Design a protein around this ligand. Structure first.
Ligand SMILES: *[C@@H]1O[C@H](CO)[C@@H](O[C@@H]2O[C@H](CO)[C@@H](O)[C@H](O)[C@H]2NC(C)=O)[C@H](O)[C@H]1NC(C)=O
Ligand code: NAG
Ligand code: NAG
Ligand code: CA
Ligand code: CA
Ligand code: CA
Ligand code: CA
Ligand code: CA
Lengths: 171, 445, 90, 407, 162
């Protein structure tokens, strides 16, 4: 199914669960927590705080199994080199419309992002019971293991702070 | 004296490469040659000199035939072209750095990542000593391990000394005050992040406490081939350090080290054929920028490049930085281990902490400053009262807050000059008369 | 007669030894009038839309240093740049 | 007090009853019937394993092994990688002729010389020729063949040259054995009579490895580059002042090298991961593939993966790693047109009848771990005559006098 | 490419000189080797990131394919030059897959036993071909197995059904 974020810090997991997390640092959006070999990882980076009403995205970091894609507002970088879009390498399509920037991978991943705020991801049914990001797990159960882990009900603000990524220079 | 001849062999013995003519696959022609004996001088610049005038060489200098020299663990004399070397006693050092990087007494560096108490070194006879150490996970995963507790079982294994990772030295489950000097061992604390333990058997310990806990063990060469643990057996060969206590040599470090669990209920650990700088893309640029300072020569680390060869410290610096959860404490611990192992070969790095790990340099108190050569015997005037009881030469200098070339440390607070230091019994002030007037250091008794 | 030059891509980030990317106008002109500062693999972006910090003027040419690109992205390398110069002929 | 048959010699510092103790296999076992562990396998009592020339026995939770002295092996492989007779790994990229082994060490009977030339543009060097001096005989291994130079008049130290798999094997009657894969990898073996009587870039073979960096003037140094620069043969050869870094001088070749060479740390070789450490073979493969930048780099790769798989066979793990896309081998080239006798044996372990061993002639080491194409001769002529690669009847093979095949 | 990589030119022009040599001398009067020599050198100077012995062996098999198509079967591969591994596919040591260097063999599959034939002749394509035994002489293609003529499969909607 589809995970999605948009608007003024609204989120939506693979199993519904619309909440609102106003975190501003750097987060894990979805990831492959299978344990043996990680297929993908999507890292979200909210901006410095645009204004009261909108909520932009500064950059998106995406690593699919060998190579790292770094998306900003103006340019797309594959493995440290700027790519001209469309880009047609035989496991990875990176194309840029006037509205959205799409990334199509053979691993069962599809990312689509207008370059301000709305970000959505689509995974196939292979990754069930393995995803571990802020998009919840992908078991199909409404709010079961995302918010009620060991009987204690997690609020959406403490569910989001668990998903943070520690960068080794900035507090 | 290169005389000209016709029909002589071009294969000449040349005072470094002797006995060339035994492998001479050429016929003979004309040219300028040597006489019957009298090999050609290669090392100097003269002609066909006699064999017992060959000047030796050793990284440069043209040593005359008879000039001795004092090398690493041996002394050598220049004989006729070759060196005659003779062994001198020199110790051996097992190190446990990072969370998991064991360097045995005979070289042989390996990575383990355990979760148990492990026997690091113990004497083989029935009793002598045993040094334990806890290597448990400190971060999130199992591959983020740390040293947590050093346990020493000394004096016929009836005295247990515990070194927790917050200071807190405790003997037989009871807190002790430092210093603590006894008949068979003594424990010191010179710099508040450094503990120095000396034993009468021949065992010396140095426990590091900040940024991460590390351990350094030193044995004499009399105990050579007489220890067992995770530090090997110390016999000169490093192929048999993975030899278990039941026969045969193991292949991997985590298969050897599961035989030295000090608790039977610990699980078995296995190797990990991954690098941490591929699993983390955000940590691998921070690791590359700062650990590269060990290799570039504009920094105060290029002074050690003639002695230490940083190519293996660079590989571990990237390992620990990408792996642990607090990446600066693993950077500054791995940069302070190149600087540690460079002061062991003479070259001391005065002032390597100015751009990289200076988050504690300026935090010293009002009178005392940050030093790089702090030693045990720079203590108070109470140490001058004994002056031959607890000095304990043989350790390495450490870097912490301390006082300059004069103005020794008082009883509390700042370090006053030598005239009004103290008179140590209770340490009296500099106004007391016994008939011994309290004076500079010594007493008129 | 003040025709523009060609594009000069005589240096690379993944080659050379100047630790970055530097493009100079020697062998073509002595004292230019104008300089244009673009990228190879996406040449409509301005220098403010790359985010890297460079200097690109008519005096010395173009300078990108890999040490200046630390902490900017996750890769820390210069992009591949190219330049034109404008010189007038009698 | 809870013993465990693995913590016997630990000391029990910090379930089964008194008496009995755990075995790591299951229920509680007495101390006499306690099993043994070796390289993550569990062997019950009275089990037999071999270690390279010896035989061991699990007696009472400990190993009881015989004490014979095995042959010692020096290695030279890839872009300047060494393993000495005492097991010390180092790197030296020199461009001259170097002493590998000799016993003219401060009068002598042999010498083995290696000729290292630059292979690439980064400054690393690899071995391309071997000269063997035995008495007054000089062999030379060069251009995929052996050449006899200067055979002496009546002494003629008895040597033997035959081809075993993909390698060429020279053996001597005096105890000197040279094994060569016809490109860059050499294995020297010495009989245990040469203990402490050799020198060179392979050390001195005295079971003590902190003196293998003894220079030509009998000085133990700590540098790889002061030791290796002292065993050059010509005085006018230059000194190596640093070791190159190929994956830093070729940044564009790193991504291919680290992806191809990751077979060694993968699930293909997972039977050998507990028996041979893959980590110095992964680092050699990446160093070798970043530096074959002038041509033919899939030969630099397939040799580095067969250096690891050879140790795996030698320790007891036969791995089949070649595919038609990854390092293919062409063994049906040698067949009589469509009668299929030459098969790829991936780990060598087959003992068939040649026309040497039918007349008693046997070697002094076991070379039955060498990868290559081996015959499986039919039942109307089951005797393999080696110097022509033909299966012959036991009568009509040849003569073998003065190391020459006469039909 | 051979001007942007001057150090790769000497290897490329020496490996690719097989085409103008005495190995291919039966095809020299039937196919012009000159645009295949220039393609091979252009291809080998430019595979500078990894795996250049794959860029080479494809360019030498583009020329040897034209030679078969015009009537000259040349056997150019050796165990040192571009080896091929066709006994990988054998049942463990029963030897049926042989390297046919010029394809020219017409055996019975389980398509052509039921009339199904192609519209061109693809019997010049290099590769490993079966030589199925005389207790099951019908090659079922979608599993690379020799089967008895009854038990091969179905072939509906371009999918093999056992
Ligand atoms: C294996 O080693 C033995 C032991 O040295 C070799 O036997 C020697 O052979 C030479 C001549 O071939 C004799 O001069 C020696 O006296 C023999 N040694 C003994 C102890 O009798 C034997 O040749 C070696 N094997 C091979 C195939 O060369
Ligand atoms: C886990 O199993 C499958 C996918 O592996 C999934 O459909 C199912 O709902 C999951 N069940 C639980 C209890 O998580
Ligand atoms: C440490 O070195 C400094 C040199 O700047 C000098 O004070 C002295 O040699 C040492 N200080 C001691 C031993 O207190
Ligand atoms: Ca759920
Ligand atoms: Ca040892
Ligand atoms: Ca450059
Ligand atoms: Ca450029
Ligand atoms: Ca030795």
């Amino acid at each position: 199914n589809v995970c999605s974020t948009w608007g003024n810090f609204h989120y939506k997991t693979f199993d519904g669960d619309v909440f609102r997390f106003p975190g501003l640092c750097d987060y894990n959006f979805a990831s492959d927590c299978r344990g043996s070999y990680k297929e993908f990882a999507v890292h979200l980076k909210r901006g410095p705080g645009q204004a009261e009403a909108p909520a932009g995205v500064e950059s998106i970091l995406l690593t699919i199994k060998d190579d790292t894609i770094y998306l900003t507002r103006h340019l797309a970088v594959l493995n440290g080199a700027v790519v001209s879009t469309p880009h047609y390498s035989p496991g990875l399509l990176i194309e840029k419309s006037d509205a959205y920037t799409k990334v199509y991978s053979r691993a069962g991943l599809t990312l689509m992002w207008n370059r301000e705020d709305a970000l959505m991801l689509e995974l196939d049914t292979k990754f069930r019971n393995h995803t571990c990001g802020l998009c919840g797990d992908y078991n199909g159960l409404q709010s079961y293991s995302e918010f009620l882990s060991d009987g204690v009900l997690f609020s959406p603000l403490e569910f989001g702070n668990m998903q943070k990524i520690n960068q080794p220079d900035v507090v | 004296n290169l005389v000209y001849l016709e029909s002589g062999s071009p294969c000449m013995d040349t005072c470094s490469h002797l006995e060339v003519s035994s492998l001479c696959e050429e016929h003979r022609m004309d040219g300028c040659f040597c006489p019957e004996g009298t090999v050609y001088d290669d090392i100097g610049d003269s002609g066909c000199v006699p064999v017992s005038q060959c000047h030796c060489r050793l990284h440069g200098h043209l040593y005359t035939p008879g000039q001795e020299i004092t090398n690493d663990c041996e002394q050598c004399v220049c004989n006729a072209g070759r060196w005659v070397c003779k062994d001198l006693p020199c110790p051996g050092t097992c190190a446990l750095e990072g969370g998991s990087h064991i360097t045995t007494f005979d070289g042989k560096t390996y990575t383990f990542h355990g979760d148990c108490y492990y026997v690091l070194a113990k004497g083989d006879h029935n009793d002598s000593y045993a040094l334990l150490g806890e290597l448990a996970p400190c971060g999130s995963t199992d591959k983020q391990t740390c040293l947590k507790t050093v346990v020493l079982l000394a004096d016929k294994k009836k005295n247990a000394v515990v070194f927790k990772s917050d200071g807190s030295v405790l003997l037989n489950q009871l807190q002790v005050n430092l210093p603590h000097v006894t008949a068979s061992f003594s424990v010191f604390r010179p710099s508040s992040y450094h503990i120095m333990v000396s034993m009468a058997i021949g065992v010396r310990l140095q426990v590091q406490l900040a940024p991460v806990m590390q351990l350094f063990v030193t044995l004499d060469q009399a105990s050579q081939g007489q220890v067992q643990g995770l530090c090997g057996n110390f016999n000169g060969l490093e192929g048999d350090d993975f030899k278990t206590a039941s026969g045969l040599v193991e292949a991997t470090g985590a298969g050897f080290a599961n035989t030295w669990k000090a608790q039977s209920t610990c699980h078995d650990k296995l190797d990990w054929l991954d690098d941490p700088c591929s699993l983390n893309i955000e940590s691998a640029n921070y690791a590359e920028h700062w650990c590269s300072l060990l290799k570039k020569t504009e920094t105060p680390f290029g002074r050690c490049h003639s002695a230490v060869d940083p190519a293996e410290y660079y590989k571990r610096c990237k390992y620990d930085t990408c792996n642990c959860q607090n990446n600066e404490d693993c950077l500054c611990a791995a940069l302070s281990s190149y600087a540690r192992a460079c002061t062991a070969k003479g070259v001391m790095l005065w002032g390597w902490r100015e751009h990289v790990c200076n988050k504690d340099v300026g935090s010293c108190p009002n009178s005392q400053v940050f030093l790089y050569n702090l030693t045990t015997c720079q203590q108070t005037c109470r140490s001058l009262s004994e002056a031959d009881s607890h000095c304990l030469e043989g350790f390495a200098p450490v870097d912490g807050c301390g006082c300059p070339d004069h103005t020794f440390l008082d009883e509390k607070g700042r370090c006053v000059p030598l005239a009004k230091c103290s008179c140590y019994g209770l340490y009296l002030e500099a106004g007391d008369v016994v008939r011994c007037v309290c004076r500079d250091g010594r007493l008129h008794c | 007669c003040c025709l523009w030059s060609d594009w000069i891509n005589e240096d690379h980030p993944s080659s050379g030894s100047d630790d970055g990317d530097r493009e100079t106008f020697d062998g073509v002109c002595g004292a230019p009038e104008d300089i244009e500062c673009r990228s190879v693999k996406d040449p409509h972006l301005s220098l403010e839309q790359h985010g890297q910090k460079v200097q690109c003027d008519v005096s010395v040419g173009f300078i990108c240093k890999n040490e200046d690109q630390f902490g900017n992205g996750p890769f820390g390398l210069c992009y591949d740049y190219k330049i034109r110069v404008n010189c007038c002929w009698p | 007090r809870a013993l465990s048959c693995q913590t016997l010699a630990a000391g029990y510092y910090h379930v089964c009853p008194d008496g009995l103790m755990d075995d790591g296999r299951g229920g509680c076992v007495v101390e006499k019937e306690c099993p043994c562990v070796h390289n993550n396998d569990l062997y019950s009592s009275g089990a037999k394993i071999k270690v390279d020339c010896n035989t061991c026995t699990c007696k009472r939770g400990r190993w009881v092994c015989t004490q014979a002295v095995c042959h010692g092996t020096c290695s030279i492989y890839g872009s300047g990688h060494y393993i000495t007779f005492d097991g010390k790994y180092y790197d030296f990229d020199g461009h001259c002729s170097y002493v590998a082994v000799q016993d003219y060490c401060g009068l002598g009977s042999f010498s083995i010389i290696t000729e290292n030339v630059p292979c690439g543009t980064t400054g690393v060097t690899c071995s391309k020729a071997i000269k063997i001096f035995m008495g007054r005989t000089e062999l030379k291994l060069e251009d995929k063949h052996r050449v006899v130079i200067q055979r002496d008049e009546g002494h003629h130290v008895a040597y033997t040259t035959r081809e075993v798999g993909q390698y060429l094997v020279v053996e001597s009657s005096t105890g000197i054995i040279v094994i060569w894969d016809k490109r860059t990898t050499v294995f020297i073996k010495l009989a245990p009579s040469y203990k402490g009587t050799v020198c060179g870039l392979c050390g001195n073979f005295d079971h003590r490895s902190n003196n293998d960096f003894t220079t030509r003037d009998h000085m133990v140094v700590s540098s790889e580059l002061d030791f290796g620069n002292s065993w050059k043969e010509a005085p006018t050869c230059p000194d190596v002042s640093t070791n190159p870094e190929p994956c830093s001088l070729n940044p564009h070749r790193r991504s291919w090298a680290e992806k191809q060479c990751s077979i060694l740390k993968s699930s293909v070789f997972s039977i050998c991961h507990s028996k041979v450490d893959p980590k110095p073979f992964y680092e050699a493969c990446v160093h070798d593939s970043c530096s074959c930048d002038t041509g033919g780099d899939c030969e630099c790769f397939c040799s580095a993966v067969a250096s690891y798989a050879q140790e795996c066979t030698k320790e007891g793990a036969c791995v089949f790693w070649r595919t038609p896309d990854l390092c293919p081998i062409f063994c049906d080239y040698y067949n009589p047109p469509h009668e299929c006798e030459w098969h790829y044996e991936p780990c060598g372990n087959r003992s068939f009848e040649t026309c040497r061993t039918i007349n008693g002639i046997h070697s002094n080491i076991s070379v039955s771990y060498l990868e290559g194409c081996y015959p499986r001769c039919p039942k109307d002529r089951p005797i393999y005559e080696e110097d022509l690669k033909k299966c012959v009847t036991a009568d009509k093979c040849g003569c073998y006098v003065e190391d020459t095949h006469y039909p």
